[PDB]
């Protein structure tokens, strides 16, 4: 069952990003805090939509896609990925990682249903690395 | 109005990009027409120093984020 | 001391590069840390005209030789 | 059966040569147009008599003879020339090429009778090359500078014209045009080309880059 | 059999380009008119040599080469190109498109002999797109 | 009259050649006597600088076109 | 057995590079002299460390690596390289060329033991080409005119120097030198070259002709 | 086995040519000294590249070619040339004399391998005569 | 004395050649040394106009008769 | 048997050449007169030595050699020359025409012995044409 993040925590994090900036160690610590439980693509996408401005959000979408592509290359380079399965029918496509696959587009409940925990942690680590890249790039 | 936005002589580039993306996304354009418009407004607005900086890009920039990153890297510190 | 080397207002760039590479290679740094230090010293020393010339490089320069070649190509003849 | 060229087309071509000159690309295009069907020696000779003045006509007769002699040397160097035959009795003499052979002198009908199509096309190509030589001869790239007030497209036009209409080999025009763009083209554009983050390896690319990043004034 | 374009039409088109410029809609209409029948590389090359100045002609040679290279990439990406054939022996090289192949250099008759109609229409469309690019670039 | 044509002190050589060939071909001479007359008029008219230029020709010039080409090549640019 | 180069010769070469520069023909001749016997990677590396400054040495390391990579591409494109062998077990890796392979790092004796003579000559030619590139890079022909008072041999020396020490391809230097002799070289020599009864098709022949028939003054 | 000439001797000879000139009897004696052992085309070519300036080097290349052509004419006029052999398969082409033949271009070791001693002495005498001609011509 | 013979400023070339050949053949030189001496005296005497005329000879003149013929052909009529 | 020309006629002809010049029609008529009987190379050579100055004599030697070479080319182009014979053993070399062959050098008697009448008339016509050339060239 999907539970959304508190809008109070999200508002506090947005104001933190607004006053301290993207690169302060306190901001990265707060992001790591709100990046503790494995989030669904819907959660991370809306979180970055709210806390980041338009141009940093575009940059972050780009960087997140690139990092997820590196993850999928490593996944096709190793059939023992915690997102993959043993047979070929469990291979994870980027539509399933970005939340674009069938039964997931716009629906967080179905998303949480079909996604694997390894998928969730890989998406989360990818999003964190992308946030780091964009923060280092913006300023 | 997005089509009336110019980068001022003294304005920085991140402020101009913020203002332009705000006015383009908060307008009556379809969602699939915002990125090309933002790019082509970066290229034709954004006073001729940055215009030439974007023009002479050895790589092809196909996203507002990539253009912003490139310009922030190679901008004239002043 | 390598970290105290600045490009003088009247000094050419090849002399500055020679002096800097000499002081960095004849120092106590490990061999695997000389190239990144030379690059980051080219970027932060080397008075702001060449600083902006290196900053606005459409290509990514990942070697002191490549940076030297680029700067020698596009330098302000004077 | 021999059909003469229209005197209207010949008059228009003569006036074209009179106003534009011998070396203009429009004039060479018009000559290529009137050089489309394989012409008999009579046709080309009268055509050059009408369109060219006396001295260019003398020069053209010389050059045409030289080129035809080169053709006949290649023909004696290969018995499979489309003008030649297999046996030795079909070897083509210069009297047959210049229209001086027996049964051809002054008579275009007999000319068209005895001549081969390979003979006609060889004569035609020879005459075209001779016209090119004389045009290049009748009317300096290393002295061309971009004036202080001149635009860059005019300078590029003038330079490319003078370099392509010169005595350089065809494989040496592009490097010369590039290196003349770099050393001529007054120091603002010189520095603009020097500080090119990309490597420009063609005159067209240099022209495009300069037109993009030029100082609007 | 190869028939050359009228020098009268070419002279009128050259004067049109001289007075109206490269980008006027009347000039593009006239070029489309003289670009009606599929032209051999010799025809288009001489046409652009006559109507364009030296620097626009250099730019146009560059652009034509680039567009022909894109065409050849699409051709190696699809063996059913109207310029290609079914077997590998009919694959079309850029020497055959630019008129540089064997039996074609400087000879328009042999050119018209060996070239395909699909080759001709592809060359013609490429030249038209290159003219459009150069016209948009010159002014 | 062809036999009265001289190259003026300030006239170029192509104008003189044009005038002379015109007057010789539009005259009462037989067709087989025009080329030798044009050559011998190039040699004796065409003021003494070009006269000496034609005289000291290491090759033998046997055609008006060849003489014109030679003189145009080796003429004193002024 | 490995024998080091004399430090006396190396000191003389270093002072030559210090006074004359990297691009002088005497310096390139001296380098060719000390590049006569096939050197081991250790020898060439230490030689360039001593004769070149820090920044030219970095540039030279880069260029040497690039040229060696081109050599290894040609080697994988032809199994008959004098550095390669017939079987796949003799294929030469860049660690063996740069002296980084096993049993070679820092030891010139072991280096000389395992290396092939073809390997040595390929390394040496690569290092020479890299030195040429860096020398051309570390320090304009179309702007050279013969001064009103300058002699012709000085002008020819200056022009040939600037043309050969430039970015032109090797196959484009002679035509450019000729066409610059013809258009530069103030109008007395211009007319002297123009009125040449023979056709001059080489800079040496043009120089000889002009030196013969020049106006003694 | 090929052994290069000492760069010390070459430097001394170059400075001799620089101070005394090309035509002094001491310079010709020094050249005769360094022309004692039969040199390979590589050796003489590099020697003249180093000791002569650019324009004298061009003149010397011309003169050397002419003298070698005279030698090859005498060789085809007499099958008993010390460079030739008895059969027709040993006839010496100018590519073999100028070092342009197969297996010789740029490689002095292979050069020394395939060349004959008569070839070497003929090349050497030709180069000496060419040097004399150029020296008489330069001043 | 042959080595003291100069072509006067107003003297023609055939008179100078006659005088020089006379003095050289009626002297104490060996018979095999007269032609080279006559040639080298034509080249160094024979005032600088004819000197330059002989110098700029596209062909190589290897006989006094050939030099005389060439000079008589290309001489400055005056 | 060889009979020399009268020194009185030769003196009169020399004074004619001295007063009237080389090109006067009276001088050419006198030369044709003294060129009536076929002369041996010795006779014509001494005649031109006496009547011509040194420089015209050099020019005449050159021109005579050239004309004799043209004659010998025509002779090798036709085996029916009145100087030639039918077999190859009668082919006439320039040493026999210029009087340089064996048994002729300096001896007019032996000259008259071995020479053919066709040889004599060819030599005479060649000398006359050479005299005409030199006379046209001298003034």
Swiss-Prot record, chains A, E, H, J:
Annotated localization: Virion
Annotated stretches, region: Involved in capsid protein dimerization: 42-50, 103-114
Highest taxon, organism lineage: Viruses
Complex formation: Homodimer. Homomultimer. Homohexamer.
Function of the molecule: Self-associates to form the irregular polyhedron core composed of hexamers and pentamers, that encapsulates the genomic RNA-nucleocapsid complex. Assembles as a tube in vitro. Binds to inositol hexakisphosphate (IP6), which allows the assembly of the polyhedral capsid.
Full protein name: Capsid protein p27, alternate cleaved 1
UniProt organism field: Rous sarcoma virus subgroup C (strain Prague)
Phylogenetic placement of the source organism: Viruses, Riboviria, Pararnavirae, Artverviricota, Revtraviricetes
């Amino acid at each position: 069952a999907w539970t959304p993040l508190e809008p109070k925590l999200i508002t506090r994090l947005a104001d933190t990003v607004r006053t301290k900036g993207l690169r302060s160690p306190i901001t990265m610590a707060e992001v790591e805090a709100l990046m503790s439980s494995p989030l669904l693509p819907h959660d991370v996408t809306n979180l970055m939509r709210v806390i980041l401005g338009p141009a940093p959000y575009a940059l972050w979408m780009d960087a997140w896609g690139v990092q997820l592509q590196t993850v999928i290359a490593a996944a096709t380079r190793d059939p023992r990925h915690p997102a993959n399965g043993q047979g070929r029918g469990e291979r994870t496509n980027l539509n399933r990682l970005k939340g674009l696959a069938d039964g997931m587009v716009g629906n967080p409940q179905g998303q949480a249903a079909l996604l694997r925990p390894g998928e969730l942690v890989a998406i989360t680590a990818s999003a964190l690395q992308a946030f780091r890249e964009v923060a280092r790039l913006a300023e």
